[PDB]
Amino acid sequence: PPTYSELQITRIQDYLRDIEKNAERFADLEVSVAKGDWQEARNIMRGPLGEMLMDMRALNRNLLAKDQPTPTALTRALTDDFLKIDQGADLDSVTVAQEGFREAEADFKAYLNSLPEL
């Protein structure tokens, strides 16, 4: 019956560190969106939070196959939530963008709660 290897465990630990460090910029994203500062909102999404998504995908690849569906689905969800923020920005609508933000925050919290016991 599959168990995590030391290598997987160490990689997970390192990717999760990076994910949680980059996740601090959710706050800056929310403020930029509230101000309709679309250029900074896109910079945040493309930069630190884009790195965060890359780190999530890398983490997910290191999970046991039985543990992969949920985190993977939620990473795709979060990717699409950022697109929703960008659709708000294109419409120059704070209101639409903040609905995307709320979905992104909920999906990211759900992603962390989906990670396995190692």
Numbering used by the authors: 34 to 151
Kindly provide excerpts from the paper associated with this entry.
The predicted product contains residues 25–152 of CyanoQ plus 5 additional residues (GSELE) at the N-terminus. The first nine N-terminal residues as well as the last C-terminal residue of CyanoQ could not be detected in the electron density map so only residues 34–151 were fitted. Topologically the protein belongs to four-helix bundle superfamily and its fold is classified as mainly alpha up-down bundle (CATH 1.20.120.290) with four α-helices, of which the first two are broken, and one 310 helix. The first amino-acid residue of helix 2a, Trp71, is absolutely conserved in the analysed CyanoQ sequences. The indole nitrogen is exposed towards the solvent, and in this structure a 2.8 Å hydrogen bond is created between Trp71Nε1 and Asp125Oδ1. The other absolutely conserved residues are found right after the C-terminus of helix 2a and consist of a Gly80Pro81 motif that is immediately preceded by a positively charged amino acid, either arginine as in T. elongatus or in most cases histidine. In the case of T. elongatus the larger H2-H3 cavity is composed of a cluster of Met78, Arg79, Leu82, Phe115 and Asp119 surrounding the Gly80Pro81 motif. Despite the fact that five out of the six corresponding positions are occupied by potential metal ligands in T. elongatus CyanoQ, no zinc cations are present in the crystal structure. Although there were no bound Zn2+ ions in our structure, we were able to fit a sulphate ion into the electron density.
The PsbQ-like protein, termed CyanoQ, found in the cyanobacterium Synechocystis sp. Here, we show that CyanoQ (encoded by tll2057) is indeed expressed in the thermophilic cyanobacterium Thermosynechococcus elongatus and provide evidence in support of its assignment as a lipoprotein. Using an immunochemical approach, we show that CyanoQ co-purifies with PSII and is actually present in highly pure PSII samples used to generate PSII crystals. We have also determined the crystal structure of CyanoQ from T. elongatus to a resolution of 1.6 Å.
